[PDB]
């Protein structure tokens, strides 16, 4: 019950998703062949949240893998935990999008979206009680930015009441990996602000800092980054799967984290994160976990909360803990940093405590923060977008696929309005 259906997109989503399903399968005792060999029976009670059952103990993830190119999934199915997925769920075309939002959304993905929906509806209709849709993609690419937002609009129009949460990789400020990022980001964001309930903004540059600074990793592959993203995606959906002293459903977070309809962009975090040599110098207790959760150096988004104020916050703990400690620490954080929390919200923290921790850890915690400092990210993209758009830097690649320059102006105006709204609610009462 309260089933979640996972949607992929592009190379980023498919690579992140493949790691998410390896982590989830690990905490539920699911072998790469699909059989269950877990020890605790609790991990099997709510296994229906992500997995469908079959004969012989085989469990099939409720995942839909889609890309405009099959090279990425062929890697997915060939790699570990790739044979787990249902073959019919690999929906793909032949000609990929050239990192342009127009092709993925209007031309290339348009003719393939129907094939995906026919799999989504079939997956959704098998759920006793559908909780929501989970999408992993990237705003800087073409498939994820274009097709991922096309799917979002299609599903929202078909399942208006269900919760839709997106874990989107955002372009980093320091260095880019695609020359047309401002166009893909601006156009993709124009869709997200209207057709999703809670977007978890992350960027690789921030995860590079975490691996370099905290984990002291000298050879951080994309597998290491994707594991970090996986852990936070597992954290926000643990109450649905395990019991605890205080539960938090996805809609429970959205209600507590989204004051206004359009301010639904979150910057996640995780704890504990320690190197292999620094593990023997740590207490591993609630007071320190809460300390690094709010540390700006341990957040998976570029924007620093110190530059703005927290509208709201969520702290989904895991492992058996003293509820007294948890509340005292959250209150302690609230008192010290009273300047960092918006004042017209008397309480800015939503708490939850799951009983079962991730494998190999006695304790854990996932941080979710809706901060007005996120306005920096969108404002930075606006500056890049308007720079290129001022002299038709690359439009012909977009307008030739069916787009129009008017849509470019509308997307920029909408993003600027959102930045204005985030700034407006950063000021105190009256």
């Amino acid at each position: 019950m309260r089933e979640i259906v996972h949607l992929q997109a592009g190379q980023c989503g498919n690579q992140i998703g493949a790691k998410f399903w390896e982590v989830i399968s690990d905490e539920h005792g699911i072998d790469p062949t699909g059989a269950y060999h877990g020890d605790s029976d609790l991990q099997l009670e709510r296994i229906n949240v992500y997995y469908n059952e079959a004969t012989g103990g085989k469990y099939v993830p409720r995942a839909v893998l889609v890309d405009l190119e099959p090279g990425t999934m062929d890697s997915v199915r060939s790699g570990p935990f790739g044979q787990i997925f249902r073959p019919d769920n690999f929906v793909f075309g032949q000609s990929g999008a050239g990192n342009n939002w127009a092709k993925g959304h209007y031309t290339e993905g348009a003719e393939l979206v129907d094939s995906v929906l026919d799999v989504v509806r079939k997956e959704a209709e098998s759920c006793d009680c559908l909780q929501g849709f989970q999408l992993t993609h990237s705003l800087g690419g073409g498939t994820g930015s274009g097709m991922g937002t096309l799917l979002i609009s299609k599903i929202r129009e078909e399942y208006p009441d269900r919760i839709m949460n997106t874990f989107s990789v955002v372009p980093s400020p320091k260095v880019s990996d695609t020359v047309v990022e401002p166009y893909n980001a601006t156009l993709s964001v124009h869709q997200l602000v209207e057709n999703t309930d809670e977007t978890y903004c992350i960027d690789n540059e921030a995860l590079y800092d975490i691996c370099f600074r905290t984990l002291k990793l000298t050879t951080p592959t994309y597998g290491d980054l994707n594991h970090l993203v996986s852990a936070t995606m597992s954290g926000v959906t643990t109450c649905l799967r395990f019991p605890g002293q205080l539960n938090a459903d996805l809609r429970k977070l959205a209600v507590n984290m989204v004051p206004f309809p359009r301010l639904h962009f979150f910057m996640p975090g995780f704890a504990p994160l320690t190197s292999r040599g620094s593990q023997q110098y740590r207490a591993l207790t609630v007071p320190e976990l809460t300390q690094q959760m709010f540390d700006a150096k341990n957040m998976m988004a570029a924007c620093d909360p110190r530059h703005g104020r927290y509208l709201t916050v969520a702290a989904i703990f895991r492992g058996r803990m003293s509820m007294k400690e948890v509340d005292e620490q959250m209150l302690n954080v609230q008192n010290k940093n009273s300047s960092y929390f918006v004042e017209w919200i008397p309480n800015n923290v939503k708490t939850a405590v799951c009983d079962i921790p991730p494998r190999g850890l006695k304790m854990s915690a996932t941080f979710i923060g809706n901060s007005t400092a996120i306005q920096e990210l969108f404002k930075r993209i606006s500056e890049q977008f308007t720079a290129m758009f001022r002299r038709k830097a690359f439009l012909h690649w977009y307008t030739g696929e069916g787009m129009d320059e008017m849509e470019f102006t509308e997307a920029e105006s909408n993003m600027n309005d959102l930045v204005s709204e985030y700034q407006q609610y950063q000021d105190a009462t009256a």
Binding site: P70, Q94, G98, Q384
Partner: protein
Amino acid sequence: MRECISVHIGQAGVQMGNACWELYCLEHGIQQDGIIPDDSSFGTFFSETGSGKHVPRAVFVDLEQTVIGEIRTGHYRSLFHPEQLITGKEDAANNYARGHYTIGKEIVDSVLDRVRKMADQCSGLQGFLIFHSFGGGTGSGFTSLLMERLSVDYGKKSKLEFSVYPAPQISTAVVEPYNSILTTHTTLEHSDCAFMVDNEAIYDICNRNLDIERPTYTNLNRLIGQIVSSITASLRFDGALNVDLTEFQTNLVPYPRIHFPLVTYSPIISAEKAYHEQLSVPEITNACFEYSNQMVKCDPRRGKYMACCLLYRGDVVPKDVNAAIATIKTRKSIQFVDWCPTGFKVGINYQPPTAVPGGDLAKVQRAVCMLSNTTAIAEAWARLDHKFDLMYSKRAFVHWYVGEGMEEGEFSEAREDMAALEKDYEEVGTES
């Protein structure tokens, strides 16, 4: 699944192709024939038959029949399909008009048919790879003739071409300025992205970095062979951050008429002096921006960058790639145009470059190929247009071109178009 049709025009393209397909066969365990000994991603370049024979997905076309006749007698005689190798009666004789109007008309309908028989045999068509010379003859006229024919039969399909751009000082033909401008005028509106290389620039690299005082054309081609392998490595192999041929068009071409990137390949190092080099990611990345390593003799710092594609290979960590590009962005000498804050497209592949036996490059661990679009190439066009203007003012060799299907006016139209393109490069390079 993916595919790439390789069309090799003229002596340059055919001889460059010989190196490309000696590398591809080596990158896939092939045995100089279609056979693979007693090796699974070849499908992008090699068609397969039930006999166990893999057939290259390439078309060799030449009006002259001496270079191709050597392939039919070479070690790869039994590799290519005999009808892929198309030969004519008489060459174009360094004349664009002959290649485009008189002799090309008698072969174009034949090469285009064999392209058709390949296009419909692909599970999905991705684009065309064109190898040709810019000096002239078949490479200047036939290509512009073929490019216009592909533009209509296949429309929006990607068309990438590798051109041996004329060198500033070195020259082997007297009428290159006529052929260079005439082909460019007829290829601007039908080509997506043209990668430029100069014989002189690679000549400098082959002795300055590789310790060889006697580079033949085989040596230059083997260097070009590596570049094309890197460009198409994403299709052929797995990687952390892949890139597709259709991505270059949007990433490198800001405007439809400005699609002439340079080329680079950093770890061009002798085997002996490689023992004294760390060959780390930050250093090779910096080598790409040095004038001493460009494969086109045009100095980047004379102009402003407009787009860059870094295609790494082998043992590469994306964190290092992030750092190296960040530092390069910091350097003030490396100037990017203001209207392009997003300057880099990045691609990472897990397959280290393979070294051809008897070759000159070292057994490197990691390599990077850089494809940069710069306003500096505007100088080369201006230099080329000056040479054309000198000859045409005297009508130095016009009678040859006019008398073989062309006309006097086309000289004026071609040159003014080049003037507009040179003007366009100036407008793009200025802001506010």
